[PDB]
């Protein structure tokens, strides 16, 4: 742990404090879940069915409230009843939370006072940027692609979903440890709308830093056990009519193939450090996020991809056979090959889909392309998951505008 | 205590200090002061930056000024510790001169203490 250094004592203590004052406390700030419009009343929060149609107070924080003076009808009843609102919930890892170290913080050739203005906020959020993620991002993308997050596409299809997002993701989350924070999931069987739940543990079950990482990887038997516990738990907390989507794992050999010859941001000035040298350095120290895939040992990379395929098939098999009363289940290939193809159709290179500093995570472009593939594949094969477009979307915007923002 | 993470962190910071001096063609001292001036006062970042210059600055200057790379520096200051038997972890290519002799030089450069701090 870095905080063992005495010189870092004060900043480590102040980071801990800021996290505690957010209201796993960070998981409640508006970067991770829809802003609570009234934190002095615990019956007001995003995702609940409206209390008395919100004739006085906006009880689900979606910016729709009050009564139409023409016909005395509540706007929430006129505009949202029948539209079948639903929330988006991600159970994820450092990719779902969009872990990101800015190259601007470590590349001297363009460094300035402007470069570190976003550092304190990133540090109090564990270097995660869920407000820009593919699942729950709501801010304007800092990159040049029109694609939006799953949450915003959901809002676009039905404006009543405003603020109904939850990113329940942790760096280092896996099928093994998800039970340690799944309690931060907020949803009430009886009072809340159904939710779309994405289960995206896409790495840490085969990713480890140990010198011999094969024994540490989860087995298909243990994974099946872990996921069934998680699904049994979700069945006791999701309203009837929910949907759960299990993501498969990636063929992580694209990392080494596309990056091993490229210069890291710290090596671009003097062309003296490639991703291969970084991977070797981190493995020698046993602190690589993924020894299995971030390695020159082609045998080890194959054993990792082989286990990831077995784990993926387990999830696919769980989705075809296991049944639950309160939600139906779906399986989705990570399918990064198709992401690469779509990027190349836009003129892009595959190496531009990886976070430059860590050489491991998908960056913002990739997360938005994964969200676009999710949307098109779900809309084509399982349209019920996403519901119908709300005919009153234009009238919602005309009466309520931006619905309070985020 | 020193571990794998402290080693990554030392190599990172020293590399940035080294490259900031190179980009502005300045002393290491002016490079560290420039880096600390870039950091916000929030969360004690700028303050911590100045605690690090105080505790480690003179030796980072002595070593970088002898054209030692960030690997050498962090091994000399014990953020990176190579257990006897275990292999050597280095991010940058091993210098022209042999490592064992490069590290002996480095240790002798910081053993000299012509200046006392009260
Ligand atoms: C936030 O919630 C509180 C309820 O806890 C609201 O306060 C109530 O407001 C009504 C006015 O319509 C009063 O009749 C109650 O006496 C109030 N309760 C208390 C405990 O004071 C408050 O108005 C809400 N505000 C918003 C903007 O939603
Ligand atoms: C390349 O990776 C493979 C897989 O980890 C290594 O082979 C295993 O090494 C461990 C030793 O830690 C043994 O328990 C296994 O019996 C080995 N299996 C095989 C198939 O070799 C291999 O040693 C690595 N190669 C190098 C050069 O590090
Ligand atoms: C960049 O800074 C370097 C410092 O190393 C300068 O180079 C030295 O300049 C003085 C001139 O008074 C000489 O004593 C040295 O021999 C020079 N070389 C070395 C290796 O020290 C250089 O002047 C600066 N460059 C610019 C563009 O200002
Ligand atoms: C001095 C060498 C350069 C340093 C480059 C940064 C090294 C990578 C640090 C980020 C990797 C950790 C990501 C965590 C992933 C997880 O826990 O799922
Ligand atoms: C020369 C003293 C500097 C040491 C303290 C600086 C630490 C900066 C960030 C550390 C990077 C952590 C590496 C990691 O996360 O694995
Ligand atoms: C010239 C000295 C530069 C040293 C900069 C390192 C100190 C500021 C960044 C440290 C961030 C550590 C945060 C953490 O421990 O999680
Ligand atoms: C070079 C100084 C600025 C570098 C800050 C980059 C982030 C620091 C390392 C992140 C790991 C951590 O904070 O635990
Ligand atoms: Ca509330
Ligand atoms: Ca409402």
Residues A372 and A339: beta-carbon distance below 8 Å: no
* Cross-strand partners of A330: A245
> Is the domain of A324 the same as that of A406?
no
Query: Cβ of B89 and A120 within 8 Å?
Result: no
In a domain, A220, yes or no: yes
CA dist list (Å): A350 to A303, A328, A354, A362: 23, 34, 8, 11
In a domain, A4, yes or no: no
> Is the domain of A241 the same as that of A280?
yes
**Closest residue to atom 14 of ligand 2, CA basis:** A212
Euclidean distance between CA atoms A6 and A12, whole angstroms: 10
> Is the domain of A126 the same as that of A152?
yes
Q: Is the CB of B35 under 6 A from ligand 6?
A: yes
> Is the domain of A53 the same as that of A171?
no
Q: How many CA atoms lie within 13 A of A338 on its CB side?
A: 12
Q: Is the CB of A38 under 6 A from ligand 1?
A: yes
| The token pair that represents A85 in the structure block | 């609102």
> Is the domain of A131 the same as that of A256?
yes
Q: What stretch of H or E contains A169?
A: strand A165-169
| The token pair that represents A256 in the structure block | 């080494």
> Is the domain of A316 the same as that of A401?
no
Q: Helix axis angle, A364-381 relative to A336-345, nearest 10°? A: 110
Query: Cβ of B38 and A123 within 8 Å?
Result: no
In a domain, A21, yes or no: no
Q: Which residues constitute the domain of residue A275?
A: 86-389
- The residue among A261, A30, A166, A10 whose CA lies nearest residue B41 is A10
Query: How do the residues of chain B divide into helix, strand and coil, expressed in percent and rounded to 5?
Result: 65, 0, 35
B23, with CB counted inside 10 A (0-12, 13-18, 19+), is middle
Indicate the residue of A1, A112, A123 with minimum beta-carbon distance to B38.
A112
Resolution in A: 2.3
Q: Is A338 annotated as a binding residue?
A: no
Q: Out of A83, A94, A295, A312, pick the active-site residue.
A: A94
What technique was this entry resolved by?
A: X-ray
List Cβ<8 Å contacts ≥24 apart for A232-235.
A232/A324, A233/A179, A233/A182, A234/A185, A234/A197, A234/A324, A234/A326, A234/A327, A235/A324, A235/A325, A235/A326, A235/A327
> Is the domain of A125 the same as that of A110?
yes
> Is the domain of A146 the same as that of A217?
yes
Dihedral angle, C-alpha A250, A253, A259, A261, nearest 10 °: 180
């Amino acid at each position: 742990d870095i905080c063992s250094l005495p010189v870092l004592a004060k900043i480590c203590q102040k980071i801990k404090l800021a996290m505690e004052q957010s209201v796993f406390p960070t998981l409640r700030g508006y970067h991770w879940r829809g802003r609570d419009c009234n934190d002095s009343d615990e019956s007001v929060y995003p995702g609940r069915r409206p209390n008395n149609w919100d004739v006085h107070q906006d009880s689900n924080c979606n910016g729709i409230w009050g009564v139409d003076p023409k016909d005395g009808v509540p706007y929430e009843k006129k505009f949202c009843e029948g539209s079948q609102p639903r929330g988006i919930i991600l159970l994820g890892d450092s990719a779902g939370a969009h872990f990101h170290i800015s190259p601007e913080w470590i590349t001297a050739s363009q460094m300035s006072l402007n470069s570190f203005i976003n550092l304190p906020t990133a540090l109090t959020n564990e270097l995660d940027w869920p407000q820009l993620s593919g699942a729950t991002g709501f801010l304007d993308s800092t990159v040049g692609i029109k694609e939006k997050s799953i949450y915003l596409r959901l809002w676009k299809r039905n404006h009543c979903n405003h603020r109904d997002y939850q990113n329940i993701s942790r760096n280092g989350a896996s099928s093994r440890n998800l039970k340690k924070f799944i309690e931060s999931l907020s949803r009430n069987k009886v009072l809340d709308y159904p939710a779309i739940v994405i289960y995206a543990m896409i790495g840490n079950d085969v990713c480890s830093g140990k010198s011999d990482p094969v024994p540490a990887m989860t087995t298909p038997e243990k994974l099946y056990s872990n996921v069934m516990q998680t699904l049994k738990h979700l069945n006791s907390h999701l309203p009837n009519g929910s949907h759960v989507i299990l993501y498969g794992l990636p063929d992580g050999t694209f990392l080494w193939d596309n990056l091993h010859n490229r210069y890291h941001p710290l090596g671009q000035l003097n062309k003296d450090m490639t991703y291969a040298q970084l991977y070797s350095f981190l493995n020698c120290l046993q602190v690589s996020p993924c020894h299995g895939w971030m390695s020159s040992n082609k045998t080890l990379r194959t054993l990792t991809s082989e286990r990831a395929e077995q784990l993926s098939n387990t999830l696919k098999k769980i989705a075809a056979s296991e049944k639950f009363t309160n939600f139906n289940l779906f399986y989705m290939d990570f399918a990064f090959h198709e992401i690469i193809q779509e990027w190349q159709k836009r003129g892009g290179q595959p190496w531009q889909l990886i976070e430059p500093v860590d050489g491991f995570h998908p960056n913002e472009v990739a997360l938005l392309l994964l969200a676009d593939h999710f949307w098109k594949k779900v809309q084509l094969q399982w349209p019920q998951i996403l519901g119908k477009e709300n005919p009153f979307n234009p009238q919602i915007k005309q009466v309520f505008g931006d619905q309070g923002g985020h | 205590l020193s571990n794998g993470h402290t080693c990554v962190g030392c190599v990172l910071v020293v590399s940035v200090i080294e490259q900031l001096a190179q980009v502005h063609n300045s002393t290491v001292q002016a490079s560290m002061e420039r880096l600390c001036s870039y950091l916000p006062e929030k969360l004690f970042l700028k303050t911590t930056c100045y605690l690090v210059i105080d505790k480690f600055g003179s030796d980072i200057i002595k070593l970088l000024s002898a054209d030692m790379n960030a690997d050498v520096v962090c091994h000399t200051l014990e953020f990176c510790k190579q257990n006897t038997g275990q292999p050597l972890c280095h991010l940058y290519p091993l210098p022209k001169e042999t490592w064992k002799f490069t590290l002996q030089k480095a240790r002798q450069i910081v053993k000299k203490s012509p200046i006392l701090k009260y």
